[PDB]
C-alpha cells in the first residue's frame, strides 16, 4: 500500500534524527580512516585537533 504524504514526512523527519545520531561516529581520534583520509589541498596529512588535553591556536 503506497505511502500518503504525512507518512513520508514523518519518516523523513525520523530519518534525519537517525542520520544525526549516525554522524556522531564519524571521526574516531587516531582511527585508521581519519589517519588516511583527512588531507590538505595537496595529499599531505593534517594534524586534526582531537587530542584530549590540548586546545591549540585560541580554541
Amino acid at each position: 500500500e503506497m505511502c500518503d504524504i504525512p507518512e513520508i514526512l514523518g519518516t523523513v523527519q525520523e530519518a534525519r534524527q537517525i542520520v544525526e545520531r549516525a554522524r556522531m561516529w564519524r571521526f574516531k581520534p587516531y582511527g585508521e580512516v581519519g589517519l588516511r583520509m583527512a588531507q590538505d589541498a595537496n595529499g599531505s596529512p593534517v594534524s586534526l585537533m582531537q587530542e584530549p588535553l590540548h586546545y591549540p591556536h585560541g580554541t
Binding site: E51, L53, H54, P56, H57
Partner: peptide
C-alpha cells in the same frame, strides 16, 4: 607528559 602532547605544543609555538 605525553610525547604527542609535547610535540603538539611545540608545533603550535613553531608555526605561530
Amino acid at each position: 607528559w605525553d610525547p604527542d602532547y609535547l610535540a603538539s605544543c611545540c608545533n603550535e609555538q613553531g608555526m605561530r
